[PDB]
Amino acid sequence: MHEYAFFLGCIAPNRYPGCEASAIKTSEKVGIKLLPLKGASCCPAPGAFGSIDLNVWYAMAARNLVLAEEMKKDIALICNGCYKSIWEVNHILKHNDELRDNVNEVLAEIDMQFKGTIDVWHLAELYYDDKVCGVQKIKDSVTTPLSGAKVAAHYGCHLMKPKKERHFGDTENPMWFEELIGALGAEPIQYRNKMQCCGAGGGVRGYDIVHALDITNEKLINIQEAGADAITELCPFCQLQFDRGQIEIKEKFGDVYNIPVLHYNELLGLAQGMSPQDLALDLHAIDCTPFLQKVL
Amino acid sequence: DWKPQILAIICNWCSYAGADLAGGARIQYPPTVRAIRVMCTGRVDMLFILKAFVEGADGVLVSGCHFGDCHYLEGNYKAAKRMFMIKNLLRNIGLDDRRFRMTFVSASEGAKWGMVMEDVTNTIKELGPSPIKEFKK
Amino acid sequence: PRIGVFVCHCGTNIAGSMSIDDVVNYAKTLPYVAVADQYQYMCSTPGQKKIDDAIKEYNLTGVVVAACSPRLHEPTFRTATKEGGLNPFRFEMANIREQNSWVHMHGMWDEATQKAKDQVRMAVAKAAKLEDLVPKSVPVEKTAMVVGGGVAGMQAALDLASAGIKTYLIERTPTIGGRMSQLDKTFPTLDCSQCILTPKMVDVGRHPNIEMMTYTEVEKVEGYIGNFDVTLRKKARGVLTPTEATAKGIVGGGCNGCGDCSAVCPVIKPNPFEMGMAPRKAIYIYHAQVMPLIYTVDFDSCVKCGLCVEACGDKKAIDLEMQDEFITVKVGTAVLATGYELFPIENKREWGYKQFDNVINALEFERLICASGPTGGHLVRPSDGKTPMKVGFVLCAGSRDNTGIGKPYCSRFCCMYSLKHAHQIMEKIPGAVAYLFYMDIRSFGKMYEEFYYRIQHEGAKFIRGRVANVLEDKETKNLHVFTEDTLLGRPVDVEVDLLVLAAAVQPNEGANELRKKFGVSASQDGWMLEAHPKLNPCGTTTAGVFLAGVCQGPKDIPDTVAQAEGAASAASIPIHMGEVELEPYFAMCIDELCAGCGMCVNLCPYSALSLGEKNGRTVMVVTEAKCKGCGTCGGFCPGGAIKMQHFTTPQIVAQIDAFFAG
Amino acid sequence: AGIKTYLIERTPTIGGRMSQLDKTFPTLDCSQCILTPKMVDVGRHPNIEMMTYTEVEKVEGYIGNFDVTLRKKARGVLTPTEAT
Amino acid sequence: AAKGDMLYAWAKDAEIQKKGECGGAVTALLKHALETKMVDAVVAIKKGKDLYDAVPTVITNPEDIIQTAGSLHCGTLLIPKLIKKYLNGAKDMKLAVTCKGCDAMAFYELAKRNQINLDNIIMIGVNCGGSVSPVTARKMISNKFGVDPDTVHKEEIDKGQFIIEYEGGHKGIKIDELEEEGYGRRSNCRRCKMKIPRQADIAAGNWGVIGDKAGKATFLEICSEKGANLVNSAQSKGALEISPADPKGIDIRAKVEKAMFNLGDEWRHRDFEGMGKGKDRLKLMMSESSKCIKCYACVEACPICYCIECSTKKPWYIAPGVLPTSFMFHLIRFAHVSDSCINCGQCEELCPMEIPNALFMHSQQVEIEKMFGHIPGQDMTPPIHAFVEEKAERARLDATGTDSIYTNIFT
Amino acid sequence: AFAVHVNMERCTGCNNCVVACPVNALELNTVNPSSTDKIYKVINGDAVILDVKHELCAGCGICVDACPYDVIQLSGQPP
Numbered sequence A: 001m002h003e004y005a006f007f008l009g010c011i012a013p014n015r016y017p018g019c020e021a022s023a024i025k026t027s028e029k030v031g032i033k034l035l036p037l038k039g040a041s042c043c044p045a046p047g048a049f050g051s052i053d054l055n056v057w058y059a060m061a062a063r064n065l066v067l068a069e070e071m072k073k074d075i076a077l078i079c080n081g082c083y084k085s086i087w088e089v090n091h092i093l094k095h096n097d098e099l100r101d102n103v104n105e106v107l108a109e110i111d112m113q114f115k116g117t118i119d120v121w122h123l124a125e126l127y128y129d130d131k132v133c134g135v136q137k138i139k140d141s142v143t144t145p146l147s148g149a150k151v152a153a154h155y156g157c158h159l160m161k162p163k164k165e166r167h168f169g170d171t172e173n174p175m176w177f178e179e180l181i182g183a184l185g186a187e188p189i190q191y192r193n194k195m196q197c198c199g200a201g202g203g204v205r206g207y208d209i210v211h212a213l214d215i216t217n218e219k220l221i222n223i224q225e226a227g228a229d230a231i232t233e234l235c236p237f238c239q240l241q242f243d244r245g246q247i248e249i250k251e252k253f254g255d256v257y258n259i260p261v262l263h264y265n266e267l268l269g270l271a272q273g274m275s276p277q278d279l280a281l282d283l284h285a286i287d288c289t290p291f292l293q294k295v296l
Numbered sequence B: 001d002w003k004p005q006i007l008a009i010i011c012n013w014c015s016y017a018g019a020d021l022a023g024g025a026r027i028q029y030p031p032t033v034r035a036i037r038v039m040c041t042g043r044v045d046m047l048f049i050l051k052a053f054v055e056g057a058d059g060v061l062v063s064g065c066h067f068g069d070c071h072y073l074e075g076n077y078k079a080a081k082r083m084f085m086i087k088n089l090l091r092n093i094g095l096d097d098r099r100f101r102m103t104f105v106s107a108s109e110g111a112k113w114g115m116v117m118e119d120v121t122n123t124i125k126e127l128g129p130s131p132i133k134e135f136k137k
Numbered sequence C: 001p002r003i004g005v006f007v008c009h010c011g012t013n014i015a016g017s018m019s020i021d022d023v024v025n026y027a028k029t030l031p032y033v034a035v036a037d038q039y040q041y042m043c044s045t046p047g048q049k050k051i052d053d054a055i056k057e058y059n060l061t062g063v064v065v066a067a068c069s070p071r072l073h074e075p076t077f078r079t080a081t082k083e084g085g086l087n088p089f090r091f092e093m094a095n096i097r098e099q100n101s102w103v104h105m106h107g108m109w110d111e112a113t114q115k116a117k118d119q120v121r122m123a124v125a126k127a128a129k130l131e132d133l134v135p136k137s138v139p140v141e142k143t144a145m146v147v148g149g150g151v152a153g154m155q156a157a158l159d160l161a162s163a164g165i166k167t168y169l170i171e172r173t174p175t176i177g178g179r180m181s182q183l184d185k186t187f188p189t190l191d192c193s194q195c196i197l198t199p200k201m202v203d204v205g206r207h208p209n210i211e212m213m214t215y216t217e218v219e220k221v222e223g224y225i226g227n228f229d230v231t232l233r234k235k236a237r238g239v240l241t242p243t244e245a246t247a248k249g250i251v252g253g254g255c256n257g258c259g260d261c262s263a264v265c266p267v268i269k270p271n272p273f274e275m276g277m278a279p280r281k282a283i284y285i286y287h288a289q290v291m292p293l294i295y296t297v298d299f300d301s302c303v304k305c306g307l308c309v310e311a312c313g314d315k316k317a318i319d320l321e322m323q324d325e326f327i328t329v330k331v332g333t334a335v336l337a338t339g340y341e342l343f344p345i346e347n348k349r350e351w352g353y354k355q356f357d358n359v360i361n362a363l364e365f366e367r368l369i370c371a372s373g374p375t376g377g378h379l380v381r382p383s384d385g386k387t388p389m390k391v392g393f394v395l396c397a398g399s400r401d402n403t404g405i406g407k408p409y410c411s412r413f414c415c416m417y418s419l420k421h422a423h424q425i426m427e428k429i430p431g432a433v434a435y436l437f438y439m440d441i442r443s444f445g446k447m448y449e450e451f452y453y454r455i456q457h458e459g460a461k462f463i464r465g466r467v468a469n470v471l472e473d474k475e476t477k478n479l480h481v482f483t484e485d486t487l488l489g490r491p492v493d494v495e496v497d498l499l500v501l502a503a504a505v506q507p508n509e510g511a512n513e514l515r516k517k518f519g520v521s522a523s524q525d526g527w528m529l530e531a532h533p534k535l536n537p538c539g540t541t542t543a544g545v546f547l548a549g550v551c552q553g554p555k556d557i558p559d560t561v562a563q564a565e566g567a568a569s570a571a572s573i574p575i576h577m578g579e580v581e582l583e584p585y586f587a588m589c590i591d592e593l594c595a596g597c598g599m600c601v602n603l604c605p606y607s608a609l610s611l612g613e614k615n616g617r618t619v620m621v622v623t624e625a626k627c628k629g630c631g632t633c634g635g636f637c638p639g640g641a642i643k644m645q646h647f648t649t650p651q652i653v654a655q656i657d658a659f660f661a662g
Numbered sequence D: 001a002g003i004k005t006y007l008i009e010r011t012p013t014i015g016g017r018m019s020q021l022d023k024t025f026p027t028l029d030c031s032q033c034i035l036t037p038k039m040v041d042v043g044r045h046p047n048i049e050m051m052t053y054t055e056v057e058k059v060e061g062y063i064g065n066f067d068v069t070l071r072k073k074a075r076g077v078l079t080p081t082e083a084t
Numbered sequence E: 001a002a003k004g005d006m007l008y009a010w011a012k013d014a015e016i017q018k019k020g021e022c023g024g025a026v027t028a029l030l031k032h033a034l035e036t037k038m039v040d041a042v043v044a045i046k047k048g049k050d051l052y053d054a055v056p057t058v059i060t061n062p063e064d065i066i067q068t069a070g071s072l073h074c075g076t077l078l079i080p081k082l083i084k085k086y087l088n089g090a091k092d093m094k095l096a097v098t099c100k101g102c103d104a105m106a107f108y109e110l111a112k113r114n115q116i117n118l119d120n121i122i123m124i125g126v127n128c129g130g131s132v133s134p135v136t137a138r139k140m141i142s143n144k145f146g147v148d149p150d151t152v153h154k155e156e157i158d159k160g161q162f163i164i165e166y167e168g169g170h171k172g173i174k175i176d177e178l179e180e181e182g183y184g185r186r187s188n189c190r191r192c193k194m195k196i197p198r199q200a201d202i203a204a205g206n207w208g209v210i211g212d213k214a215g216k217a218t219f220l221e222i223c224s225e226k227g228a229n230l231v232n233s234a235q236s237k238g239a240l241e242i243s244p245a246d247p248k249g250i251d252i253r254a255k256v257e258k259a260m261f262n263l264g265d266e267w268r269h270r271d272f273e274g275m276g277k278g279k280d281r282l283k284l285m286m287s288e289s290s291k292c293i294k295c296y297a298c299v300e301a302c303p304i305c306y307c308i309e310c311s312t313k314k315p316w317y318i319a320p321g322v323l324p325t326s327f328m329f330h331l332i333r334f335a336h337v338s339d340s341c342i343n344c345g346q347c348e349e350l351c352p353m354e355i356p357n358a359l360f361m362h363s364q365q366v367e368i369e370k371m372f373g374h375i376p377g378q379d380m381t382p383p384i385h386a387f388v389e390e391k392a393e394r395a396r397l398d399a400t401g402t403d404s405i406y407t408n409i410f411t
Numbered sequence F: 001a002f003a004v005h006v007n008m009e010r011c012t013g014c015n016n017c018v019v020a021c022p023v024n025a026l027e028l029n030t031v032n033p034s035s036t037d038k039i040y041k042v043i044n045g046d047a048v049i050l051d052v053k054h055e056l057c058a059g060c061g062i063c064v065d066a067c068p069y070d071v072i073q074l075s076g077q078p079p
């Protein structure tokens, strides 16, 4: 049973707690142990906080990293934006000496040092790796087939891009996340421009809601045209955009889709037999009941 | 009263070309190193280096082609093995082995030749006068 | 010994960095120096006259010139030393310009003067110990080899043969012609590309002075400028030419190219000439215009069914049990003309080359548009066989790219061939529109700008924007090309029926292996390197090897042919003379110091050293022709039994001693 | 290659535009410096009849024999050979 | 009997078996080879005078090898260089040579450099726990043992102590105690670790012989097919008796060999740190080497020095008449020999000026060895500079993790 | 020489994959046993395949047909 510190940023615990609950339960069912991070905070959200000040972005991400450093554990994440912040600041401060120095003399005011001893993983990346739980182990753990459901994957942008800074391979047409959805028994479908941004990154969600919603609506149109019955995602930002933004699209525009948006951990819980009440699917703006009728 | 005496033995086909290119491009560096110009660095016998160090070279530099880029297919592998062994001998006779180094400078690296010149001069200046000159007496 | 020291000013390039007067007075007070003197331009005729007058007056044994680099002016001053009654090799330079002045210009003058005095002292010390050498002259075999049967190889072979030298033309493939045989029409003259080549192919096939050896490779090369012992692998073609059949005893003949064999062969495989678009049997020719019309058998795919031999009948041209024969050929010079291949553009995933059906590259487009190709010359969509009406051309596909996937250089001809293809589609399909997504149209050659003007006049759309990514419509299989029109200032989404990628070119497959066999180095770009990038673009640093064609860097057919004839001329220079002088830097074994240990023998890359019998003692023997003067053996030998002719240990040690003299 | 050659130049010196160039793209070599050896080779070659400051008045003939008439413009100064 | 067998061997001839130090198997094998005409001569050590004088001897009469029987512990000489100089390198005649570990290593060094013919030479190797200089042994016996040295009959190093047999009885003193007091084995013998010459054709010793044969049997290890043939021929013609060795004997032979390795390591340590470090080692080396009077005994005695004319004799390296000679003289030997020094000690012990040539050279050799991984004198592996390899050179440059040869090479 | 994969998560230790494998049954149930190596052994309650390098299986399907609650997947394609 591999053990990881569970970073747990802002949106999953405070808006979609079923995501974190299913994360812990399903990760324990497969051979992974997710340990609470002691006093972790907002990973300085890369858009809304990196746009303001890169130095304080570095300092806060480094503080989050040195918490798990003192814990002597590897970070595990469930958010693409949190992955950007944590993993990328870890990578930058493992190689840039003057930035290490600057962050260290900022952190020395709170009796705290960064040395760069741990690694950062996304939970879906762990589920895909073969040393850690693999696709076959996920298939083994699945107990409810979830058959006869068309499911559209949204990769997001901060997990895989830029490919010159990550290690997940092709960004033009990846299929790894489609294999994790196929392990659950749901057939993943392909839609036009599947690698498009959801529109919520960089603080655009806050600065220009209509612009962000138009970017989201382009995706929703493509997904409905494909014929999806739900949208899996690996990011609470993207889930919030696809969930709230459907309501804001219904009100600001006149478009109705009613497409449930679920984190992959929530689908994994559904596959492994967790209850909809135990997943808190009532906390989503868009009702999941048609999808539950199909897969149950 | 003291100026470092550094001697370089540079091959004709990459290190002499690189030094010439640095000169042509007008890259300045201090005037402390004087060169010998053999055809390949395979020509460099160990006794050349040891003779330099016993005459009183504060430093010795041997510059040649990159591995795989010798004009004579493999003559700098022989030189590299010889200079590794020379580094070992100087350490065990108690002379400071950082007085000697072997750099691989291509025909197009005039800038790198200038940087090598600067770094060799700096290192020998830190090290100081060689001890042989007073140990002889 | 009596040495003269002549210090050049180089026209203030040296006098503006040091004190030439002080250097000259120091040279006068140096030991062994008879005369020291200075001049403004020692490389000029008054400078050589000054050297010669000094030699005659002062009875000089050797000459030291404190001037520019030896790599720049050894031949000049060696010839000046010869003219004057000395050996050319009693001369030594002291580089006090490119290694003293130009690097110690600013704010440091007496330091540069001291460096110059040191360099002059070391040069005088070496020259006081130099002695007479005579360059070795070696005979040159009167044959030549041309590796590559493309336009550059064929032109070089024809040029050498018509100059009268017997020539070998080695081609790995069963036919000569190269890429130009695959081209359909040629920019900017729009001539039938294959047709222009056909007379020249016939000339090569008929020339009595050319030994055309197709379907053959170069296993190994040893030797030098004089004699290159080149071993060739005659791959098992499986079919006998009439000459070989008569030699083996079959009077009725060999292969006449009737085609019955391929009419009955049941195996069907892709044709590499047609870039895989077209079928060909196990026994086959690339196209109907191949020069040796001899019908290779593909033994990796033949099932030995024996139908081909029954079809061939009494001609008996097919030998299904043939094996790779090896031949050793002695040649005087060699010309390398290996050409190029298209860079693998499936690595650029944003342009769905392998993943979308209707995305092709420019050689596949050229085969699709040729009238002899898999189609009847009709461009049709690969996805469904329908005629396109909008065609996009992605220029710079994988080129001028610093991301590590593509090539950082320009492929030279891809702007021109994309213009040609746009013209061809707009004239062959009525109402079709060509869109060129370009980033610097490069029409630099003769009539190229006029060709560009004419294409725009016929109505190709030029959108200045590098393509960002390509999406495939799920149903119509149409391709959505996304970029920005940089001049218009807006993003665009052009939906085309067919997308053509103008991919970069790279050195052919196996070219690095062949150039390592011949001893040629590579460029920064990865192409074969030339002797001097400006004034010698054909010859290489290894003597007797010359470059021709795209193998030295991408070029159009005109530039390729000019380069090929230049290489043929350079390869003919030593063959016509019949003599060639080697540089007397050889190793010479001193036998009554050799102990016969034999340890130096393995230190020679060229195998110039061996153990032999002289006066009962086993001593080492140098093949002075094979030696190249590197000095590895002579730097090894513990007993000092190997002497390097112009860089002897006493000379080098005298230089070291003079450096430490104060 | 061994053929006797005439080199006609209208100007008093060989070299051309490259002699006027200062440095050469893309290698940034001293243009005049790289040219200096080859000029010396041309001036010393026994098989080259270097005729500077000379023009071609008329040409008649064909592939076999070209009867080319040259105008040796009045240089005003004698080479050592012509002086002797 | 076959290339790896470990045997007990003694001579059938009772007189040969008495005069052998152990069972006479080296003298029975040499006698058999000579008289059955495997070999044309035999190069062994005999006493020329008192047992402190060891004289090499080429023997062709099979009647003279009984005089060669017995081991002389004061025989500090080296045989293979004599075969190259005065027997034409055994290029035309077969020989059978009795040799210690240093003499086997020297055979292999000279055969690498093509100076002898190991196809012709047969090497019967003996175990060696150390040799004493004859004059130092005399002073040892006069002072520490309190005996007149001319009284001694035999003397041997057995169980790490120096047993002498004189008229009156026998005595014994620990060799470690003697070596602390300033006597004992030679310095290079204290540092030596070539205890069982497994590179020879046969290895004979008194280690591992236990029980009823503790002084009348030789432990034989057959180390090659040539030695197997010699042994089988001798046993069949009946000049030598063979019984398979005792497993307990093999075990304690291994243990004594391992303990000798550890002792050699300890002496290597204490000597090499006794030389100093940094500029102190340069003043030690330079002040010692300023004594050299250029007798060239070190060059003429070294097995690795095979050059017709030494570079130390060339006027551009060493000034011919300047007697307080340069440090270049010894730098030229460090450069040429230190990569393959077999620690024979001949250079140290033949120096009129008492310069620690072997100590300096071995101090350099041990870590040229741990750098390049080349053990001198074991087999036909070419010297490190006579065989340079492309892949290995890449490997040592990459291991430094650096673009040059400057640093990150040593710990 | 195929590859068998056992889903440890639902293996009950029933040992009917060990008893039913005809390569396991070679040692004790054959006259003059040829090979005595075994694919499965139930260690700590779940079936462990000792045949790591996929040399002894023969794709028989006796073990896939034997497990009561399907948990053994047989791969007929090269690993």
Ligand SMILES: Cc1cc2nc3c(=O)[nH]c(=O)nc-3n(C[C@H](O)[C@H](O)[C@H](O)COP(=O)(O)OP(=O)(O)OC[C@H]3O[C@@H](n4cnc5c(N)ncnc54)[C@H](O)[C@@H]3O)c2cc1C
Binding pocket: C147, C148, C149, C150, C151, C152, C153, C170, C171, C172, C173, C176, C177, C178, C179, C180, C183, C185, C186, C187, C188, C216, C217, C218, C337, C338, C339, C340, C362, C363, C366, C413, C417, C420, C508, C509, C510, C511, C514, C548, C549, C550, C551, C555, C556, C557, C558, C560
């Ligand atoms: C799509 C496209 C269109 C083009 N259109 C034009 C055009 O319209 N006009 C124009 O002027 N140029 C055009 N070009 C460029 C033109 O093709 C080249 O200038 C020309 O072909 C160079 O010929 P080459 O002989 O140097 O090389 P190649 O034609 O490639 O010939 C090399 C030959 O050597 C052989 N060979 C390779 N390696 C070995 C080996 N190891 N041993 C033996 N043989 C070997 C190959 O099989 C081949 O036969 C075009 C290029 C492309 C890609």
Ligand SMILES: Cc1cc2nc3c(=O)[nH]c(=O)nc-3n(C[C@H](O)[C@H](O)[C@H](O)COP(=O)(O)OP(=O)(O)OC[C@H]3O[C@@H](n4cnc5c(N)ncnc54)[C@H](O)[C@@H]3O)c2cc1C
Binding pocket: D008, D009, D010, D011, D014, D015, D016, D017, D018, D021, D023, D024, D025, D026, D054, D055, D056
């Ligand atoms: C500003 C500039 C910079 C350049 N820089 C570079 C550079 O960095 N690198 C590079 O590679 N190229 C460069 N080039 C191009 C380069 O100059 C040419 O490629 C090259 O000079 C061509 O030489 P040529 O012998 O053909 O012509 P020219 O050099 O012009 O030589 C022609 C010669 O013929 C003589 N002549 C003319 N008419 C007659 C006649 N009727 N009878 C007798 N003699 C006659 C002329 O006097 C002249 O000596 C540059 C060009 C320019 C204009």
Ligand SMILES: Cc1cc2nc3c(=O)[nH]c(=O)nc-3n(C[C@H](O)[C@H](O)[C@H](O)COP(=O)(O)OP(=O)(O)OC[C@H]3O[C@@H](n4cnc5c(N)ncnc54)[C@H](O)[C@@H]3O)c2cc1C
Binding pocket: E019, E020, E021, E022, E023, E024, E025, E026, E027, E030, E044, E045, E046, E054, E068, E069, E070, E071, E072, E073, E074, E075, E076, E077, E098, E099, E100, E126, E127, E128, E129, E130, E131, E157, E204, E205, E206, E207, E218
């Ligand atoms: C200096 C020395 C130290 C030794 N130390 C040990 C030890 O610690 N442990 C051990 O087990 N064995 C040691 N031996 C070997 C020991 O003597 C063997 O047990 C013995 O050689 C067995 O042979 P043997 O009695 O059967 O034949 P022997 O009849 O003894 O034959 C001995 C042979 O050795 C030759 N010989 C004698 N002196 C020398 C010499 N100085 N150099 C070379 N050859 C010589 C003789 O000529 C003869 O051919 C040592 C030998 C020597 C020479």
Ligand code: SF4
Binding pocket: C008, C009, C010, C011, C040, C041, C042, C043, C044, C067, C068, C069, C073, C097
């Ligand atoms: S010889 Fe060299 S330094 Fe002297 S004038 Fe000529 S180019 Fe200048």
Ligand code: SF4
Binding pocket: C239, C254, C255, C256, C257, C258, C259, C260, C261, C262, C294, C295, C311, C312, C315, C316, C317, C318
């Ligand atoms: S049938 Fe025979 S002669 Fe005719 S093409 Fe085939 S091989 Fe040649």
Ligand code: SF4
Binding pocket: C264, C265, C266, C267, C281, C282, C283, C297, C301, C302, C303, C304, C305, C306, C307, C308, C309, C320
């Ligand atoms: S043997 Fe059969 S498969 Fe081969 S070429 Fe002839 S007909 Fe075709």
Ligand code: SF4
Binding pocket: C395, C396, C397, C399, C400, C409, C410, C411, C412, C413, C414, C415, C416, C439, C440, C441, C442, C502
């Ligand atoms: S020739 Fe034109 S299309 Fe080809 S790489 Fe250069 S700029 Fe791009």
Ligand code: SF4
Binding pocket: C589, C593, C594, C595, C596, C597, C598, C599, C600, C601, C619, C620, C636, C637, C638, C639, C640, C641, C642
């Ligand atoms: S020249 Fe030197 S290395 Fe070569 S065989 Fe003679 S002694 Fe040995």
Ligand code: SF4
Binding pocket: B072, C586, C587, C603, C604, C605, C606, C607, C608, C609, C622, C626, C627, C628, C629, C630, C631, C632, C633, C634
């Ligand atoms: S110098 Fe020596 S090693 Fe080099 S090519 Fe000549 S003989 Fe061979």
Ligand code: SF4
Binding pocket: E100, E101, E102, E103, E128, E129, E130, E131, E188, E189, E190, E192, E193, E194, E195, E343, E344
């Ligand atoms: S050096 Fe070693 S093998 Fe030679 S005598 Fe001394 S201890 Fe014995």
Ligand code: SF4
Binding pocket: E291, E292, E293, E294, E295, E296, E297, E298, E299, E347, E350, E351, E352, E353, E354, E355, E357
């Ligand atoms: S043996 Fe001693 S004195 Fe003689 S040359 Fe060697 S070091 Fe000098």
Ligand code: SF4
Binding pocket: E301, E302, E303, E304, E337, E340, E341, E342, E343, E344, E345, E346, E347, E348, E357, E358, E361, E362
């Ligand atoms: S240097 Fe001395 S100790 Fe080393 S092998 Fe030579 S003689 Fe023996």
Ligand code: SF4
Binding pocket: C638, C639, E299, E304, E305, E306, E307, E309, E310, E311, E312, E332, E333, E336, E337
């Ligand atoms: S020191 Fe060197 S040159 Fe002198 S004999 Fe020994 S190996 Fe030969």
Ligand code: SF4
Binding pocket: F004, F020, F021, F022, F023, F024, F039, F056, F057, F058, F059, F060, F061, F062, F063, F064, F074
């Ligand atoms: S398939 Fe057959 S042989 Fe393979 S493990 Fe199962 S029962 Fe055994």
Ligand code: SF4
Binding pocket: F006, F010, F011, F012, F013, F014, F015, F016, F017, F018, F042, F046, F047, F066, F067, F068, F069, F071, F072
């Ligand atoms: S038969 Fe099935 S449940 Fe029983 S041990 Fe085997 S795999 Fe497990």
Ligand code: FES
Binding pocket: B011, B012, B013, B014, B015, B039, B040, B041, B042, B063, B064, B065, B070, B071, B072, B075, B076
């Ligand atoms: S040519 Fe420069 S190292 Fe060999």
